[PDB]
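Replying to the earlier thread about multi-chain prediction with a worked example.

Input:
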Amino acid sequence: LNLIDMKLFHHYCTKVWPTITAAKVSGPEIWRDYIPELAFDYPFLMHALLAFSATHLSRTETGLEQYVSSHRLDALRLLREAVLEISENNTDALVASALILIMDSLANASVDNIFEMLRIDEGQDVDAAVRGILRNAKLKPVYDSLDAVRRAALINMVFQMGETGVAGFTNSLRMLQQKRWDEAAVNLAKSRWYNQTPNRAKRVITTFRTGTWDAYVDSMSPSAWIFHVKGAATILTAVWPLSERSKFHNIISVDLSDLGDVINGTELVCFDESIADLYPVGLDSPYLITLAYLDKLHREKNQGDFILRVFTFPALLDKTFLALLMTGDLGAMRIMRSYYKLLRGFATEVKDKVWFLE
Amino acid sequence: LNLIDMKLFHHYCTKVWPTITAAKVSGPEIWRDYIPELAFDYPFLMHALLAFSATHLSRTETGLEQYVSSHRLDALRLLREAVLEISENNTDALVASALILIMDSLANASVDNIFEMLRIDEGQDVDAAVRGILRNAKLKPVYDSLDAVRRAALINMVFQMGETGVAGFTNSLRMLQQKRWDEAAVNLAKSRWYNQTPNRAKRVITTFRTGTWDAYVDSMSPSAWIFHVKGAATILTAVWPLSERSKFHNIISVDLSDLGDVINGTELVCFDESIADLYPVGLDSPYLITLAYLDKLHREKNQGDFILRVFTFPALLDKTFLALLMTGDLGAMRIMRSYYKLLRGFATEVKDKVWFLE
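Result:
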């Protein structure tokens, strides 16, 4: 009498799929009622479905940190077994339970990146250092207007040089409040802070100008996601390519789209703004089939599909692009770098999309 | 009346294929007389064959820097056209002309890496700085015994700190002459050179201990090879997979070998000696199918086949390994790094295999 489980299943079907496509009308059939459908004949899929739905519920009911880990580990052991004998069992089911298991570990997104930032700059007295920033004569209006990426830099400055040091940059703070980090970043390279700590300062300032954590991404922590794509590939390699019948490829970029995104693919804009290189090129560039793909990853947030484009990405990487990267082509590494950005940032904008407290 | 061309062809068939397998008896049929065979019906292949053979001849007759570039550019334009319409033309031919065009640019290996090294350390008075090393009381016996990788480091020391500075390391030079760079590298970390220039010194010393240019590979120049694998992939992606018939896959690792190299694949030794990590693992490691491949690349020097394993490497990279790298798994990047070593080093040991002067 699993009845708590039936409660969990009800919870899935009624309540968590609309988060999964993230769209009420776009492809609801897949998650609302293809996956539950498959879930019955395959226990790894039911286990994944229950564990994911249970993690989603914990946001409200306290309860069940226990059952999530149970169905987690059931789903994993069974799915490990399920891979080796694909004849006995559907592959759409294996793909589903892949993507679901991903989104589940994605919801355990405990990596809060501000800690990571000061990890990098200094090398407890950690939390509640704000008491003297927003409760401060001149840092209030600037901190009160900033976004979270730039609030981080200002907090980093206070931790380095105290509430009353940061208050000294009258011209820059009037500029940051004024949003011209275009040249507010300019006025900060002439700071005697920047002279005495140039490495920390330069990477703080690009954070203020850009928004993205570009300067710090290379040494970033990011790894709770990574372990789950380790085993996840295991089940891509099993099932690829997918049976002519199986519901997945069609949904796969409307099956590519006769490269319709490529006709103005040159014409889509950076969206990263950091590569800032060669990227005005037309067709005759080995980057396009794979920069167009990144555009498509960036271009849509529907949670399941974004994960789907990731899960399928190594079975679809350009043989001519993979070849460059394997050589060591700088553009290749610097748009695979940009992929570890798209990824790390997608979790940041999903768990920021999701309740944290309050 | 191309008769100089017939001379070139004769030159190919009689004289350059045994360099191409690098083995007189191992697979001579392919190059000695399958490739000439195909060469007649396809002009891109004949053009590549002539251009390659002509570059090989220039080593003796002065003549023809001209005809090499001619057949080069003929082969390229025609091969560009030949790719788009594979129905009209064999794919073994396209693969051949790929590999041959590679080995041709490989023979124009003008990158001499000592210049690259001091590029890195300082940032003309370039050549003939030796006059005061081997013609020097105490540096003679050490320089006279060293190999070329370690002669480079000693020369780097003289350029930094003069003939008579380097002569000061009596204990280390007795040790380097004594070949215990095991701890001769130890005695050099306590040098007041190393104190005043630690960055340059540390990377000099690992060069002395290791042999490989590990410390300097990351900032190395290496690029005359790279451009040719750019377009080379273009013709892998066209022809992959190869027609059930075409002579190539069979030769492809005896078609893999039922993973026979994998049964003691854990058991093959580093050969890099720099990864030095995890590499004692057994099977359950996503690195193996691709570290076993690197072993196989390292394990055989037959020039054509080594190039063949490279040309085919992106159509064969592990989907589970490619997936990690795309994430950013450190082991993945640090054994793709080790691949840009195998590559850069293969040219170094082919053109060192080949006549330079004298």
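Chain A touches chain B through 30 residues (CB under 8 Å).

Feel free to reuse this layout for your own posts.
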